Design a protein around this nucleic acid. Structure first.
Ligand SMILES: [Mg+2]
Ligand SMILES: [Mg+2]
Ligand SMILES: [Mg+2]
Ligand SMILES: [Mg+2]
Ligand SMILES: [Mg+2]
Ligand SMILES: [Mg+2]
Ligand SMILES: [Mg+2]
Ligand SMILES: [Mg+2]
Ligand SMILES: [Mg+2]
Ligand SMILES: [Mg+2]
Ligand SMILES: [Mg+2]
Ligand SMILES: [Mg+2]
Ligand SMILES: [Mg+2]
Ligand SMILES: [Mg+2]
Ligand SMILES: [Zn+2]
Lengths: 111, 115, 69, 174, 217, 148, 37
RNA sequence: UCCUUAAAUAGGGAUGGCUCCACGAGGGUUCAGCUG
RNA sequence: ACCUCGAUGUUGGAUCAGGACAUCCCGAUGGUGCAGCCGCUAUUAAAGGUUCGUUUGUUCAACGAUUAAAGUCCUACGUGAUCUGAGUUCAGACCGGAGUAAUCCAGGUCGGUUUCUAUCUACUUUAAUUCCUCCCUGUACGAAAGGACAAGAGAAAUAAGG
């Protein structure tokens, strides 16, 4: 199967510089897993994003519709939305300026 | 239905959206073959004497059943590349944005509440 | 200033406990984030912001609004 | 009303034989032809969707009138020019409408989308001619459906696979 | 006996068999999903599966501001304000993806259509999302809330003061001058309540529909 | 690596010299429209481009349309853009006329000749029927050498 | 193909053939030489 | 050349001659609202 | 200076457009200083399409934002017994200039009546196109940077018919 275990395994194999995972509660109507990863540069971000997308496409879930790759034009933030999980690749500055961690752990208790 | 010249509410944490200005933001162009903007459609916007891209995230015009009809034409500011200008969205954002064609993961991630 | 002097320390202890069994995420990054959150801010707040800060920390500890796995 | 259907000799049926809604089946694609709603003599703006003229800014007695009907050189009006006249009340056909369900008890066909003509209007229904649906008649009753055959008494309602049948548990997109 | 509005058909030349079929389908769906009794102005919580999300349930609580449509396609539009943002949703009653409908607070309002709540103050549309359901006595007429809302400045979505709307839940004295009221009275149309051929009598239709419902039971 | 390019800026249109005449005004005055300017040739730096293989050896900046009658102006020549690698030294005769190292940088190599004026431009109270129509200025034509 | 009123062989391998009603100069070594009447 | 618009052939500002207080169905520009 | 001076002002705009192809886009090919993507050039193709705004009568033009493209023309510089009169055209009045003056002006400005009930001809219900996204596939090609076809799927937009 293609699950968050596959996510973390592939991301660690390609050596994401920093990884984080949020278990989105079901009562929030977005997804199940919110993965946020930082990378060295835009080239590395694009490489790892394409790698994970290839693994998704090749592994299983033929009946599952194919998956976009958003943020290709931008260099500092890409994002891939899977059926049950969403991965957000970015750089340290983008991560620290958008603070997705606080947003998605403290829904209404941050600025 | 956000057309040209519509006054739109910038529902975002961005300085451009939250800063006072004698002229309210107005749609300058609707990035659609027909100049009619629905949820998820991009638009140009005149903020503070500046041209900025933005995304429609709700409008007064009724849509298909089961979708929310907001009291004001809400819009989120996005850079040319696509990164949202602001870092937070306060008012609810319709969930239908997820499955629509186009990139909306960044906007959904920034969003706090869904409806 | 805070709800109690020991409340913040107990909350930090509990957060570190919950990070002990951290499986998927980067443990070092998680610890760094917690250190940043509890050091860059918790030095010189006003007597009022302490309640909000500890409330949000407690909610994060609880994790019914999304937990780190 | 009597309508003529072009058929191959394979499908000839003895005159007097009845036909039933089950002659079609869910998932089939069908063509429905009928007289559209008659709107009588209608102006050019409603009949052909002309832009008309502005309401103000001096327009004197020209708000819904046709503009120049033709150029000055030809000294005539081309045949087939779009002009005010009777609209509707003509036979139009909708092609490739999916059959979503068939109520056998009342002989009702649930055809996707709109059909020409008013309510309680007689429509002529036949298998879709579109190339995509050229050879989909393998499983349909070829001559017609014969209830007298009684090979298998059909249920009260035949549903297409994707139709959310009433009485089924509320759909969850899991 | 509360017959849901959608059952009663709007008069027309459409054949009664179509209504019979539609009522059969509606009742057969109601056998699965309990559609509780409610009126315009009553607070409802609707739980529905999100198709955009992976079936994750979504709950929306709001005051039903209008009941429209007939037959299977009948809808009710209900309103609320979330973080100060007015939101209205039109829910189809018989959509197979509405998991549940809960009448959080069953009550009737002075008007059969509360569309003017858009122009009324936000307080009259605000409702706590987590408000607990109230309980009404099993044998008790539905309460009629005689609240008269205060309206914001005159520019409104519609000319509510006009007689054709026949609004009773607005404090017109507070927002409109006597001169404005007199001007609005120019559209009175007193004969419209006395032209007897305009009235639609649905006694026999309601009786037949009740017989059909009882047979379905 | 290295490419000799011949950029030729556009030529401004030559203004027209005509006069108006209408039923109830026979001497309606000048109608000579001005000519459009020639389109400049601008080397814009491109980050994606990494070698000078793409750039051609002959660039001809579009020339502006000549002015017409009825005071009609001429469409100015559109700008011709030469995408070049970041860090491209542009030299005429060993002059290093440009460096072009930063992203978004651009150097105008051959400026399109300005458009010629029409007689209506010279129209004035003193001059009630000018016949002059300044010819459209020729466009620049220079040989620039590109070195990475 | 370039349209020419007079067809001229440019290199040795260029050959003239009358096809589909008109003359053509075809060339394998230098297909640049392709000409049509 | 500056302001006004995203865009400005529009508008505003850098003895006679100045001086617009008030007024104008005069001629231009304009904020906001308004509206088929 | 050949018809029309024995009631047709004219330019723009609105409306509807018919037509040519010397093709702006979409289609098919040859060449290339065509590796791929972009392009350039030539042959064939007129079925379909060919945007909205600011200034200004303005056609045009400049500028803003787009588009696959915002094609060149003819049609009494198409069409005003279908519309408008914003410039321009009479009577009024100013600025500048000529003139002794009356007055005048290819200049600038403010204003300024747009009739027609249709006799005849003609006519009045005659298989869509394109963009984008995904797949192929960050595959072919390339050293890399970049980055394709074809085929398929999904979304839209316009147009026709309901
Ligand atoms: Mg500005
Ligand atoms: Mg109109
Ligand atoms: Mg009128
Ligand atoms: Mg309104
Ligand atoms: Mg103006
Ligand atoms: Mg002679
Ligand atoms: Mg040709
Ligand atoms: Mg001519
Ligand atoms: Mg005039
Ligand atoms: Mg004059
Ligand atoms: Mg005037
Ligand atoms: Mg006047
Ligand atoms: Mg007239
Ligand atoms: Mg007439
Ligand atoms: Zn040869």
């Amino acid at each position: 199967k293609f699950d968050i275990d596959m996510m973390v395994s592939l991301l660690r194999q390609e050596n994401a510089r920093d990884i984080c995972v949020i278990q989105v509660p079901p009562e929030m109507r977005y997804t199940d897993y919110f993965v946020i990863v930082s990378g060295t540069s835009t080239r590395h971000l694009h490489a790892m994003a394409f790698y994970v997308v290839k693994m998704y496409k090749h592994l299983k879930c033929k009946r599952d519709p194919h998956v976009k790759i958003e943020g290709k034009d931008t260099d500092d933030w890409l994002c891939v939305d899977f059926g049950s999980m969403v991965i957000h690749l970015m750089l340290p500055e983008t991560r620290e300026i958008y603070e997705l961690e606080k947003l998605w752990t403290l829904r209404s208790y941050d600025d | 239905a956000i057309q040209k010249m519509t006054r739109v509410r910038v529902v975002d944490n961005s300085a451009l959206g939250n800063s006072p200005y004698h002229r309210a933001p107005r749609c300058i162009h609707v990035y659609k073959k027909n100049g009619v903007g629905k949820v998820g459609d991009q638009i140009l916007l005149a903020i503070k004497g500046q041209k900025k891209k933005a995304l429609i995230v709700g409008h007064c015009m009724p849509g298909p059943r089961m979708t929310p009809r907001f009291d004001s034409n809400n819009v989120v500011l996005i850079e040319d590349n696509g990164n949202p200008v602001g870092t937070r969205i306060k008012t609810p954002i319709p969930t239908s944005l997820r499955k629509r064609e186009g990139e909306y993961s960044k906007v959904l991630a920034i969003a706090q509440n869904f409806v | 200033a805070p709800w109690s002097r020991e409340a913040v320390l107990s909350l930090y202890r509990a957060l570190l406990r919950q990070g002990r069994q951290l499986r998927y995420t980067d443990r070092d990054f998680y610890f760094a984030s917690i250190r940043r959150e509890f050091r860059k801010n918790q030095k010189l707040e006003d007597a009022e912001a302490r309640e909000r800060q500890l409330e949000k920390g407690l909610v994060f500890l609880n994790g019914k609004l999304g937990r780190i796995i | 009303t009597v309508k003529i259907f072009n058929i191959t000799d394979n499908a000839a049926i003895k005159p007097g034989t009845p036909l039933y809604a089950a002659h079609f089946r869910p998932g089939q694609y069908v063509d429905v032809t009928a007289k559209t709603i008659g709107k009588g003599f209608q102006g050019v703006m409603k009949r052909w969707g002309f832009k008309g003229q502005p309401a103000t800014h001096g327009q004197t007695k020209t708000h819904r009138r046709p503009g120049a009907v033709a150029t000055g050189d030809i000294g005539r009006v081309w045949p087939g020019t779009k002009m005010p006249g009777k609209m509707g009340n003509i036979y139009r056909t909708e092609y490739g409408l999916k059959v979503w369900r068939i109520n056998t008890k009342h002989n009702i066909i649930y055809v996707n989308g709109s059909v020409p003509g008013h309510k309680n209007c007689l429509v002529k229904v036949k298998d879709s001619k579109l190339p995509a649906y050229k050879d989909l008649g393998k499983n349909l009753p070829f001559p017609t459906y014969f209830p007298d055959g009684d090979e298998e008494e059909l249920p009260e309602d035949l549903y297409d696979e994707n139709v959310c049948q009433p009485g089924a548990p509320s759909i969850t997109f899991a | 006996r509360f017959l849901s509005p959608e059952f009663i058909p709007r008069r027309g030349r459409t054949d009664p068999l179509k209504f019979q079929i539609e009522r059969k389908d509606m009742l057969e769906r109601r056998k699965v999903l309990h559609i509780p009794e409610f009126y315009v102005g009553s607070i409802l919580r609707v739980t529905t599966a999100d198709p955009y999300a992976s079936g994750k349930i979504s709950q929306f609580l709001g005051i039903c501001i209008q009941r429209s449509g007939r037959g299977l396609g009948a809808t009710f539009i209900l309103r609320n304000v979330i973080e100060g943002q007015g939101v209205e949703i039109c829910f189809e009653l018989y959509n197979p993806r509405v998991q549940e409908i809960q009448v959080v607070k069953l009550e009737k309002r002075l008007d059969d259509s509360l569309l003017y709540l858009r122009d009324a103050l936000p307080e009259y549309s605000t409702f706590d999302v987590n408000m607990k359901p109230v309980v009404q006595e099993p044998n008790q007429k539905v309460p009629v809330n005689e609240l008269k809302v205060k309206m914001k400045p005159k520019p409104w979505s519609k000319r509510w003061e006009r007689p054709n709307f026949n609004i009773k839940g607005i404090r017109f004295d507070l927002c409109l001058t006597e001169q404005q009221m007199k001007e609005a009275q120019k559209w009175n149309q007193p004969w419209l309540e006395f032209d007897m051929m305009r009235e639609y009598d649905t006694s026999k239709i309601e009786a037949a529909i009740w017989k059909e419902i009882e047979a379905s039971k | 690596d290295y490419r000799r390019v011949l950029v030729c800026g556009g030529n401004g249109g030559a203004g027209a010299s005509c006069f108006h005449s209408e039923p109830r005004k026979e001497f309606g005055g000048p109608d000579g429209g001005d000519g459009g300017n020639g389109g400049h040739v601008i080397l814009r730096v491109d980050q994606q481009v990494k070698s000078l293989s793409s750039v051609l050896s002959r660039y001809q900046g579009f020339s502006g349309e000549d002015g017409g009658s009825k005071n009609c102006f001429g469409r100015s020549g559109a700008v011709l853009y030469i995408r070049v690698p970041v860090g491209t030294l542009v030299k005429e005769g060993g002059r290093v006329v440009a460096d072009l190292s930063c992203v978004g940088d651009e150097y105008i190599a051959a400026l399109g000749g300005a458009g010629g004026k029409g007689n209506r431009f010279f129209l004035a109270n003193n001059n009630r029927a000018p016949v002059t129509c300044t010819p459209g200025q020729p466009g620049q034509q220079r040989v620039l050498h590109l070195e990475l | 193909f370039k349209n020419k009123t007079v067809l001229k062989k440019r290199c040795k391998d260029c050959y003239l053939v009358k096809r589909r009603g008109r003359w053509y100069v075809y060339c394998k070594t230098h297909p640049r030489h392709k000409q049509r009447q």
